[PDB]
Scaffold this active site. Structure first.
Site, short mmCIF file in Angstrom:
data_model
loop_
_atom_site.label_atom_id
_atom_site.label_comp_id
_atom_site.label_asym_id
_atom_site.label_seq_id
_atom_site.Cartn_x
_atom_site.Cartn_y
_atom_site.Cartn_z
N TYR A 56 34.20 11.10 -82.58
CA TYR A 56 34.51 11.95 -83.71
C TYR A 56 35.94 11.76 -84.16
CZ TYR A 56 30.27 14.92 -83.45
OH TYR A 56 29.00 15.46 -83.47
N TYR A 98 35.59 18.38 -71.44
CA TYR A 98 35.43 17.80 -72.78
C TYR A 98 34.21 18.24 -73.57
CZ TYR A 98 39.52 15.16 -71.74
OH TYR A 98 40.83 14.82 -71.46
N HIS A 109 32.44 11.07 -76.77
CA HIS A 109 31.95 11.65 -78.00
C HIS A 109 33.08 12.26 -78.80
CE1 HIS A 109 29.64 14.84 -80.27
NE2 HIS A 109 29.00 13.74 -80.61
N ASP A 110 34.00 12.93 -78.13
CA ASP A 110 35.17 13.49 -78.78
C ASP A 110 36.03 12.38 -79.40
OD1 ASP A 110 34.29 15.99 -77.83
OD2 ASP A 110 35.78 16.07 -76.22
N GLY A 122 31.95 20.60 -75.60
CA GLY A 122 31.91 21.88 -76.28
C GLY A 122 33.24 22.38 -76.78
N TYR A 159 22.96 14.42 -91.00
CA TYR A 159 22.43 13.07 -91.08
C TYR A 159 20.94 13.12 -90.77
CZ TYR A 159 23.18 13.61 -86.07
OH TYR A 159 23.18 14.11 -84.79
N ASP A 177 26.64 10.72 -82.16
CA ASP A 177 25.75 11.70 -81.55
C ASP A 177 24.66 11.02 -80.74
OD1 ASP A 177 27.30 13.62 -82.77
OD2 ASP A 177 25.68 14.48 -83.98
N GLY A 221 36.53 20.17 -75.73
CA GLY A 221 37.43 19.03 -75.57
C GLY A 221 38.84 19.47 -75.29
O1 LIG Z 1 32.17 24.08 -82.72
C1 LIG Z 1 32.43 23.62 -81.59
O2 LIG Z 1 33.28 22.73 -81.39
C2 LIG Z 1 31.72 24.21 -80.39
C3 LIG Z 1 30.24 24.48 -80.47
C4 LIG Z 1 29.58 25.70 -80.98
N1 LIG Z 1 28.26 25.68 -80.73
C5 LIG Z 1 27.90 24.57 -80.09
C6 LIG Z 1 26.66 24.13 -79.66
C7 LIG Z 1 26.55 22.90 -79.01
C8 LIG Z 1 27.67 22.10 -78.79
C9 LIG Z 1 28.95 22.49 -79.21
C10 LIG Z 1 29.10 23.72 -79.87
#
Ligand SMILES: O=C(O)Cc1c[nH]c2ccccc12
Length: 121
Positions: A51, A27, A47-48, A29, A64, A89, A31
């Protein structure tokens, strides 16, 4: 925004969001599906979902503001979307901190096909 989340993650944990939490488990980065691999992955699952609660917000890009009151994260007032994104977050960053003790490097770059089945939020 994603970059702010990344800074919050580093502040909380001392790990860089990329690569420590950008491809972790099922999940973090990206999901999708599967049973979360461990508590850290469950932070990402929630977290997913968090969102997912905000279908008309843009959590990746909308910025934010937050401050620290001693250690504690305090989300400052912006738009409703910004406030809600910040709370998602903040929770995830705290969750990562709470589960640093069981973080496992073997779940970095975890392959997608080992993540199967829908888990409802
Ligand atoms: O865009 C996304 O869903 C992935 C993503 C790209 N760079 C990142 C850096 C930290 C956490 C998630 C992401």
């Amino acid at each position: 925004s994603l970059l702010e989340f990344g800074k919050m993650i580093l502040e909380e944990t001392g790990k860089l969001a990329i690569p420590s939490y950008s491809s972790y488990g099922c999940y973090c980065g990206w999901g999708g599906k599967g049973t979360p691999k461990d508590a850290t992955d469950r932070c990402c699952f929630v977290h997913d979902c968090c969102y997912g609660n905000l279908p008309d917000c843009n959590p990746k890009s909308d910025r934010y503001k937050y401050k620290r009151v001693n250690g504690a994260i305090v989300c400052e007032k912006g738009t409703s979307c910004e406030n809600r994104i910040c709370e998602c977050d903040k929770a995830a960053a705290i969750c990562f901190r709470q589960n640093l003790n069981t973080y496992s490097k073997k779940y970095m770059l975890y392959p997608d096909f080992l993540c199967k089945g829908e888990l409802k939020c």
